[PDB]
Structure formats: structure tokens, C-alpha cells
Design a protein around this nucleic acid. Structure first.
Ligand SMILES: [Mg+2]
Ligand SMILES: [Mg+2]
Ligand SMILES: [Mg+2]
Ligand SMILES: [Mg+2]
Ligand SMILES: [Mg+2]
Ligand SMILES: [Mg+2]
Ligand SMILES: [Mg+2]
Ligand SMILES: [Mg+2]
Ligand SMILES: [Mg+2]
Ligand SMILES: [Mg+2]
Ligand SMILES: [Mg+2]
Ligand SMILES: [Mg+2]
Ligand SMILES: [Mg+2]
Ligand SMILES: [Mg+2]
Ligand SMILES: [Mg+2]
Ligand SMILES: [Mg+2]
Ligand SMILES: [Mg+2]
Ligand SMILES: [Mg+2]
Ligand SMILES: [Mg+2]
Ligand SMILES: [Mg+2]
Ligand SMILES: [Mg+2]
Ligand SMILES: [Mg+2]
Ligand SMILES: [Mg+2]
Ligand SMILES: [Mg+2]
Ligand SMILES: [Mg+2]
Ligand SMILES: [Mg+2]
Ligand SMILES: [Mg+2]
Ligand SMILES: [Mg+2]
Ligand SMILES: [Mg+2]
Ligand SMILES: [Mg+2]
Ligand SMILES: [Mg+2]
Ligand SMILES: [Mg+2]
Ligand SMILES: [Mg+2]
Ligand SMILES: [Mg+2]
Ligand SMILES: [Mg+2]
Ligand SMILES: [Mg+2]
Ligand SMILES: [Mg+2]
Ligand SMILES: [Mg+2]
Ligand SMILES: [Mg+2]
Ligand SMILES: [Mg+2]
Ligand SMILES: [Mg+2]
Ligand SMILES: [Mg+2]
Ligand SMILES: [Mg+2]
Ligand SMILES: [Mg+2]
Ligand SMILES: [Mg+2]
Ligand SMILES: [Mg+2]
Ligand SMILES: [Mg+2]
Ligand SMILES: [Mg+2]
Lengths: 90, 42, 273
RNA sequence: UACCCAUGUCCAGGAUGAAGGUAAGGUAAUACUUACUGGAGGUCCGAACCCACGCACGUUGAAAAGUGCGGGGAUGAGGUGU
RNA sequence: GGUAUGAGUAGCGAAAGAAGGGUGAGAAUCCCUUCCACCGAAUAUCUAAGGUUUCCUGAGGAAGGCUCGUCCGCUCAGGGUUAGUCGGGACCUAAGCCGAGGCCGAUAGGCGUAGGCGAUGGACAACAGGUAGAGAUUCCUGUACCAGUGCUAAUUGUUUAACCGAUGGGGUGACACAGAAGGAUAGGGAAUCGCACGAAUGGAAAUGUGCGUCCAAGCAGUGAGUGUGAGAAGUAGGCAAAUCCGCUUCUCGCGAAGCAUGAGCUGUGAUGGGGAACGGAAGUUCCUGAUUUCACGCUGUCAAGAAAAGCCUCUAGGAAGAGUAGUACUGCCCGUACCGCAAACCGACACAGGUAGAUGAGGAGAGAAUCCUAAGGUGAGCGAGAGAACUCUCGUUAAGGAACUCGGCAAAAUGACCCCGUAACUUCGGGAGAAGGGGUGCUCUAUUAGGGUGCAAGCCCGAGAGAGCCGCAGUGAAUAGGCCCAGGCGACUGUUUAGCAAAAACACAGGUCUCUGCAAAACCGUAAGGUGACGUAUAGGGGCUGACGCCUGCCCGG
């Protein structure tokens, strides 16, 4: 399903700075190929996707009182919609 | 020049899980570390 | 011919080399080359089983026609080439049907000569016949022991054997060693001494040149410790303080005969060397 | 770490001038001589690099084998990576 | 386990700092400015490994940091890594590893065939700009290429078979080392041109000073050169077949063409981009010149120098669809942060050690040496005084000059280039840089003579001599052999006791003895299977001796 592949939007100074450039940053399933992300975004948001760039983030090691461990590994997809395509809101 | 010149590949090829599994004595080692309850086999 | 190098260095001082006069090309036949990796005296267990081998120059194997099977069809000697894998030179034979093969270059084998193999071949140098067809007294090489197996016996540079007689289904050959033995008469041999007979005169000249040929240094038993060699140990130099000089593995190594006592081939040896 | 295997890679600069070749001579022809050419070598001098000869210092060290000043090899039986 | 003693003692880990300003509760130590100093074939720029968030921003100052601390590679929060083309995989194989059946073996297992895996190698399409707290050949802009896909349009084919074409054949792919001479281009430099200035202290409006003086892949042309006799018949081979390869014969022969390759150049790309100065000028000519490239191209040598895919071709096969043009669309996974001669890697440390590769400017120079600098980086995580003994690291030293000492150990001296000159002995190569001497700066004659470059203009290199001139001294600094006579040992270059021995020891070329007829002997293994060797007595194993020269006596009873 498409809403399994797209987890949640990414809201940061960086992610929010490129919304005007029609680039939408999502946290996507760690197994999702950029092709699956393209077709998922089109199904969910009714937009025309020009390109999808994708990057893997390894888990970040965090301490909390002599207990240490890794945050979740993340897969981040930046989805550029076409000029003619309607925007996604956030 | 000290002993211990690290190599990711050499570490797994000599001591890794699949190398341990590839021999009967290697499997004895895995069984022994499971018996002692090690967090890290291989 | 042997070229003697002038003593421009202590390294070159007594060194000699082939002039490679007989060699007619520096380029082997690409189709007849196979890769060859150095074993450096190591077994299929990876263990050193023969000492003093390792680290020579890289070599390609040339596939040699030791069988000389191609009966009736004439072969033109196209070139005499250097072969790093053996003491003899090799000759590229262009057969009239367009098959190319390498043979051991016999002494007197020239580019342009034609060679034949089989029952109708003349007793002319690089020709190959069954021993039953080869006259008594002929000088031969590349002698096969089992029919169709290929020549094994007299192949090294300058060597040659002589047909002595014909005793049943066996021919008597005097081998290069001076051993007289019986070869089955349907085995074939090539006519002529092998060639590159100057090969034994070469003075290697320097340690490094032995290293290029893949020979690592030999350490004498008498300068090892007693746990390494029967000659090991002793304060200062020691004589061989043993009833016999020994190999590194025990066993006497001066005069002690090692041919197996109950050997099947003993019936075919007429005179030991 | 030792030896080995396959596959890569490194070696500032300078010096010397082997064989061979060509041209003159030379001879019946050859040896041979001179000049030019040629560019050999576990060749020479010398950095990188590799080594570790002397001395000093260090000796609860900067270091569980180093540093400093000198030293040896430096196209090779060479160094080094995977 | 806690706590003493030694003791406020040793130590605080190679190094240059200074002041002013700021911040702050607090400042030698954080920030900024200026000057000073250090590295600069690195102490700079990339990048592999390795590390794994150390990266950026905002807070912090318990602990960590050998001092301090407002600061940090530390603590806490948020953030940050974008690819059809870069590297790896959806490609290829080497060593090696695994290995269906198989062979061998008390068990376990060992070996090995087909077949696989396996880079350190092969193949393979993207460049220049912009942007920035943190990525960038990845984002954006511009301009491309590679492989596909559909959709239009013509075109041709639809069983003497367009087209595709093997898992098969063949070619290529495909390779060492050394040397020499070239072409080109990077780089370097000088003028030119552009812009700015006109000056502190005696002088200068100019031979004045400062700064700058251009640009991709792709596409289309060209091109130093480098290789390469073509055509036709014909076929005991290339597991079948072949029009392909191989082989043979014949005709035509030439340093000429084609044909392949090929650095670079010229156009375009660019009305674009960048650029000394909120702005946009100049882009030229000449010299020098690679360690890069043409290119292992050429020549030579012996020690004789991967494979496979890929690509091309051939048939065997399969075939109604195929290509051409145009259009728009499609292109997955992994890595991408940051450190990377280092405080982030290996050394328990923020440790004088170790760490592959690419790049690595100028003057003088042969040079990557040396000294001083450029770009760029850095002032080294304790300081302030003092200027005793003593210790270490250095500099100088009257007269003497090895008297020191086991021993000239250490230090001193020598040192570069040019010229003169050079003995014994010798294996005729050497010895030899033997030894021992002499010269070396600046000015003028002098854009000298004479070279290189070029169409010129110019630019570069450049002796021998003559005159002169200064110093105690002219490779004025730094960096650069001490030498000789004679003897022992080892011929020689090599090798060795990681960490007290580098040697006369080992090795070595050479000698000799001996074994070994090939399923060799020898060696590993219970065996299979191996090495020997894809070798075959001019070969292989073992013992001893150790270049070369002259030699190598007697004894076979044990
Ligand atoms: Mg990616
Ligand atoms: Mg460790
Ligand atoms: Mg041997
Ligand atoms: Mg000993
Ligand atoms: Mg001993
Ligand atoms: Mg013993
Ligand atoms: Mg003894
Ligand atoms: Mg004695
Ligand atoms: Mg190697
Ligand atoms: Mg040398
Ligand atoms: Mg000593
Ligand atoms: Mg040193
Ligand atoms: Mg020397
Ligand atoms: Mg040297
Ligand atoms: Mg005290
Ligand atoms: Mg004290
Ligand atoms: Mg103190
Ligand atoms: Mg310090
Ligand atoms: Mg230097
Ligand atoms: Mg930081
Ligand atoms: Mg503190
Ligand atoms: Mg802070
Ligand atoms: Mg293999
Ligand atoms: Mg295989
Ligand atoms: Mg693979
Ligand atoms: Mg960055
Ligand atoms: Mg883009
Ligand atoms: Mg080849
Ligand atoms: Mg980066
Ligand atoms: Mg360090
Ligand atoms: Mg190193
Ligand atoms: Mg600077
Ligand atoms: Mg004095
Ligand atoms: Mg005096
Ligand atoms: Mg005395
Ligand atoms: Mg005295
Ligand atoms: Mg005395
Ligand atoms: Mg004495
Ligand atoms: Mg001394
Ligand atoms: Mg002299
Ligand atoms: Mg000087
Ligand atoms: Mg010696
Ligand atoms: Mg030596
Ligand atoms: Mg030692
Ligand atoms: Mg020592
Ligand atoms: Mg066997
Ligand atoms: Mg000896
Ligand atoms: Mg010997």
C-alpha cells in the first residue's frame, strides 16, 4: 500500500526552505525504492513527480543515564513535483 | 607498527558468523557462546 | 653460440649467455598459449613439499605437440622460438591444412624445412615414426613409453637416444643417461638430437640470475641447528659426524639407491646406467 | 612476523659508457686501429623510500625499542599496497 | 577495599609570541584586529583504509582537557549526507575459496569435476558554472551523453526468407623490463593590455608602485605522428557448419595512397559563464617547458612478460516485423556527513612512533637536495621570573697537537662546480673523485663572439679573453668525500639474532659427489589427491665445498 511506503513528512529549517522550490521531504519505509516512493506520492497527493532523491540515515547513538542505544535508521526521500503539478500543503 | 591493522573484510572473513557456521568446530564455538549467553556471537 | 660478457662489474665478471642466434621471432603463437601460475614448491595443502622454488619471472605455457599425431600431412617449420618452460627451443609447424602446432626444435631444424609424421615419413631429422619403422643406430628424441601418450623420455636441450635392436614387440633404446631399456615398438620417436646443445655451458654468473629462474637459496644442513637437520649443531664448523651424510629427512644421501626394489619396469631395463 | 601466490604501485636528479652498429684506414681476404654512434650494469654519486653501523641522550621514557647528529642500500637477490 | 608516606616533591609530552579591543561573575589561555614568528615534496590540497556522528547550529561548564576556560573532538538538545553518468552491486574473471554427482577415509571428515564465489586487475555514458550553517561531477542553471520506452511520420519486409543471431568457431581484448629522440599540452615566466594610485624620510610622473591580464564536456572539423603490400582463386584444420579464421598459390607493388589509430589544435558550446574594481575593464604576444600525454609508440635486452567478459565477425539456429527520422517520457540498490601524516586511524593517553596513493609553486639550483618564500596552513592546552652548582643540547678558545684512551671514541677537518694532474697492483673492467694542486665576487668592453626560438619584431641561453674595482675572506650563507701505507678474514651486490651480536656467520655464481628412466627420485598426506612438472638425465632431489688462479698427496684395516 502507498501510506505504508510514505511514513510522515519531514519538518526542519532545511525541509521547509525547499517547499517553495516544489521539493517535499518525507520519511519513507527503509525498504522503499525511490520508484515506489514516486508512485506512492502520486497516489496519495494527486501530483506529477519529476524526480525523487533518497538518502539513508544511520541510527544516532543516544545515552539516558548509563543506558545507551541507537535511534531508528531513517530513509529520507526528497520529491520534486513538476512545474504544472499542484503543490503539497504541509 | 603495531599488531592489529584493522580491515572490515578481514575481520568478517576470519571471525564472522558465516565463517563460524562453515565448519563443525566453528559451530561448536557458536554453540558455546550461546550457552554462556554472550550478547555477541561472531 | 655462447656470448662471454666483459667484466664491467663483479656481477657480470664470469657470466655467459646464449646469443639466441637460432631464435627467429620474439612473439609466440597467441592460440597456443595457456596461463601458468608459480606453485613455489607448495602442495594442494599449501605446504612447502619441495625446497628452493619460488618467485621467478612470470611465464606463459606454450602447448607442445609431444604426440606428433598429424600423420601424412606435411608441416612447414615456420619459426624457432624461445620457450621459458624448457631448456630446448620450440618450432612453430604450419601444417598444409592450416593447423599450427609447436614441437621440440631438433638440432638442425631450420625455418622452411618440411617435417612429416607416420609410416611413410623419411628418416630425416624432425620426422616422427613408430620405433618399429626407425632403423637400428638412428639418433632419436621425444620417445613415448605408452602408444599415443606422447613423447616423455629424451626432450631436454642437446639430449639424444639411439635405437640399438628390435627384440619381439619391443625395441632396445640407449637413453640419454646410458640406460639401455625396452620401449614398446608401436611407441613413436622423433629423429635427431634435441637442439640448443650449448645450453649446459651457460655460467649463470650472479645470484640474482638464479632468482629470475625461480630458484631460492639452498641452506647447507651443517649450518642448521640439530632440531632442523641431522648435520645441524656442533661448536664451530663440524665435520659430518655421522656414519653417512644424511638428507634433511634422515635417509643416507651419498650412494644410497632409491629406485623401488620391487619395480614393475625392472623387466624392461637391460643395462642400468 | 616468515616464506609464498595473484594483482597493483613507487624509485628527485646527476655520472659512467659494455656488447652491438656505421665510417674511415688496414689486408688477398681477415685480425686489427681510430673516430663517431650505441646505452649494458645485483654499475657509480645522491634525495624520496627502505634499512639500522657509531656515538650521545632517554632509561617510574615523548616511546614496553624511540629521538638527535652522523651511517648503508637506493633499477634490484629492490621497496610497498590490496 | 580504604587511607597514608615519599610531597606540594618529579612531571605538565619537541615549537614565538605581543599588545589593543570585546565578551563574561571571572580571562596569559575564548572571539576580533594588527604586527611578529613557523611549515611550504609540507605542517599545503585531494583521496583509499580505518574510525563511526567526531560534522553544523543553539545552549552548558559537574567530570574529561596534564594549568585556566566564557572554549572544545567534552555534556545536552535540535539538525545535517540527494547521483542513469563518481566508487561498488544488478558485468568480467586472477590468486584463493566453496563445490551437485565423484574419489578417499574408525566417526568427524579430506580431496576434487561440472558449476559457482572472489579485486588488488578488465569493461563501462557529464561537464562548466552557481549556491551554502552543515552535501554537491549528487541540489540548481546551462549544455550534454548512454541505455531503453511508447507515440506520430514516411520507408522497407512478411517463407528462395528484411531482420536477429549463438551458451558454438575465429579475431581483438591481451599486458615484461630498459633506453633514446621527438610532437603536443599542464605548469612556469616576461612583456602587452586593463584598472587603481602618485606616495611617509633624501630621490623618482615613470624602465614608477599595486592588482588583474579567461572558460568545460559534448558536437563538427582538423591533426604531430604512429602502425599497416592489397585483391583474387583454392581448401586433409578450427568437436557440426561457415562467406569468418588459418594455410597455399597466383596476379597486381610500394615509404604513395587508402585503412586504422592519435595526443593536441580550430570552430561551436558562449547573446553564456567568470573576472581587477553597489558596480564590470582587459584576455594579446613571446620565452621556457614537463615527473603528464601521444605511448611500452619506437629501439633493444633476456629473465620471454594474467584471465574472462566485452567488442567485431562467422555460420548453426530463430524469424514478421525491422530499422531511420522526430517527439516526449523511463533509468533500481549500496556509499556519499566529518577526520584522514592525524587530538577523530594503529600505538591503554588530546602519546616526538607507524599509516598506501594523486597533486606538490618561485629565486638560485642537476634536483622533490639546500636556504628564504608563494598558495595554503600553523604559533603546538601550563605560565611569570631568575640567569647559581650540576646535567643535557650548542658556540668560541692562548700555546701545544693524540701527550687522551682499551681504541683518535667523540669532535674537528674534507665537501659544490671548472681546470691541471694522478702510483703500486690488476681478473685489463679497474684501482680513480687515487694522491696532489689551481680557479670561483663585481664592473666595463657586452642586445660580445657564438647558440636556441621566430616570418619579423623581439625573447631566451651564452663562453673564452682584455681592461678595471672592493673585502680578512667571492660555491662569501645553507646543503654536498678526509686521505694514504700495510696486514688478517670473506671473492663480489645481497642476508641475519623484531627488542644487547651485521660479522670472519648465511647466501651466492662456480666445483664435486650422489640419487633419479618418468605413476622418476625426493617431499606432504591414513588415503584420495598433490608438489616435483603441465618438467623428462643439458632435467629434477639430496650432501659437501664456495668467484677466480695454481692445486687437491697417502690409507679401503674399521
Ligand atoms: Mg544515493
Ligand atoms: Mg584493539
Ligand atoms: Mg634444491
Ligand atoms: Mg648456527
Ligand atoms: Mg644453535
Ligand atoms: Mg637429529
Ligand atoms: Mg653434527
Ligand atoms: Mg672445532
Ligand atoms: Mg605485491
Ligand atoms: Mg647499485
Ligand atoms: Mg659494532
Ligand atoms: Mg637517521
Ligand atoms: Mg656502495
Ligand atoms: Mg647511493
Ligand atoms: Mg625530595
Ligand atoms: Mg627539586
Ligand atoms: Mg620543575
Ligand atoms: Mg605541551
Ligand atoms: Mg626538503
Ligand atoms: Mg565542532
Ligand atoms: Mg581543569
Ligand atoms: Mg561552548
Ligand atoms: Mg581459480
Ligand atoms: Mg572453475
Ligand atoms: Mg562477483
Ligand atoms: Mg564540507
Ligand atoms: Mg539536477
Ligand atoms: Mg598475451
Ligand atoms: Mg566530503
Ligand atoms: Mg601523534
Ligand atoms: Mg612508509
Ligand atoms: Mg600566505
Ligand atoms: Mg686551542
Ligand atoms: Mg691557536
Ligand atoms: Mg698514547
Ligand atoms: Mg696514558
Ligand atoms: Mg694503555
Ligand atoms: Mg690496539
Ligand atoms: Mg669518529
Ligand atoms: Mg684529488
Ligand atoms: Mg656558499
Ligand atoms: Mg662478505
Ligand atoms: Mg654489503
Ligand atoms: Mg639484536
Ligand atoms: Mg646491532
Ligand atoms: Mg603421486
Ligand atoms: Mg664453507
Ligand atoms: Mg653450490
Amino acid at each position: 500500500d502507498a501510506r505504508d511506503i510514505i511514513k510522515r513528512p519531514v519538518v526542519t529549517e532545511e525541509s521547509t526552505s525547499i517547499l517553495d522550490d516544489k521539493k517535499y521531504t518525507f520519511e519513507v519505509d527503509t525498504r522503499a525504492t525511490k520508484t515506489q516512493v514516486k508512485y506512492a506520492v502520486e497516489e496519495i497527493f494527486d501530483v506529477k513527480v519529476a524526480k525523487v532523491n533518497v538518502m539513508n540515515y544511520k541510527g544516532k547513538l543516544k545515552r539516558m543515564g548509563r543506558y545507551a542505544g541507537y535511534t531508528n535508521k531513517r530513509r529520507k526521500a526528497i520529491v520534486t513535483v513538476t512545474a504544472d503539478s499542484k503543490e503539497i500543503q504541509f | 607498527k603495531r599488531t592489529y591493522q584493522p580491515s572490515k573484510r578481514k575481520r568478517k572473513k576470519v571471525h564472522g558468523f558465516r565463517t563460524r557456521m562453515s565448519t563443525k568446530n566453528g559451530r561448536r564455538v557458536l554453540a558455546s557462546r550461546r550457552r554462556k549467553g554472550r550478547k555477541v556471537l561472531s | 653460440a655462447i656470448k662471454k660478457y666483459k667484466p664491467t662489474t663483479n656481477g657480470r665478471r664470469h657470466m655467459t649467455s646464449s646469443d639466441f642466434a637460432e631464435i627467429t621471432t620474439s612473439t609466440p603463437e597467441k592460440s597456443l598459449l595457456r596461463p601458468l601460475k608459480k606453485k613455489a614448491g607448495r602442495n594442494n595443502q599449501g605446504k612447502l613439499t619441495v625446497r628452493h622454488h619460488g618467485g621467478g619471472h612470470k611465464r606463459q605455457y606454450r602447448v607442445i605437440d609431444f604426440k606428433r599425431n598429424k600423420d601424412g600431412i606435411p608441416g612447414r617449420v615456420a619459426t624457432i622460438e624461445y620457450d621459458p618452460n624448457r631448456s630446448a627451443n620450440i618450432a612453430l609447424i604450419n601444417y598444409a591444412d592450416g593447423e599450427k602446432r609447436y614441437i621440440i626444435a631438433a638440432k638442425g631444424l631450420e625455418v622452411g624445412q618440411t617435417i612429416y609424421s607416420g609410416a611413410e615419413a623419411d628418416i630425416k631429422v624432425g620426422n616422427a615414426l613408430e620405433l618399429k619403422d626407425i632403423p637400428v643406430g638412428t639418433v632419436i628424441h621425444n620417445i613415448e613409453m605408452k602408444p599415443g601418450k606422447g613423447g616423455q623420455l629424451v626432450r631436454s636441450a642437446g639430449t639424444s637416444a639411439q635405437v640399438l635392436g628390435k627384440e619381439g614387440k619391443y625395441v632396445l633404446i640407449r637413453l640419454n643417461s646410458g640406460e639401455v631399456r625396452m620401449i614398446l615398438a608401436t611407441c613413436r620417436a622423433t629423429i635427431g638430437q634435441v637442439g640448443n646443445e650449448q645450453h649446459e655451458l651457460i655460467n649463470i654468473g650472479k645470484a640474482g640470475r638464479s632468482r629470475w629462474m625461480g630458484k631460492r637459496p639452498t641452506v647447507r644442513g651443517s649450518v642448521m641447528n640439530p632440531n632442523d637437520h641431522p648435520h645441524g649443531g656442533g661448536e664451530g664448523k663440524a665435520p659430518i659426524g655421522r656414519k653417512s651424510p644424511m638428507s634433511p629427512w634422515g635417509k643416507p644421501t651419498l650412494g644410497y639407491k632409491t629406485r623401488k626394489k620391487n619395480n614393475n619396469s625392472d623387466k624392461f631395463i637391460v643395462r642400468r646406467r
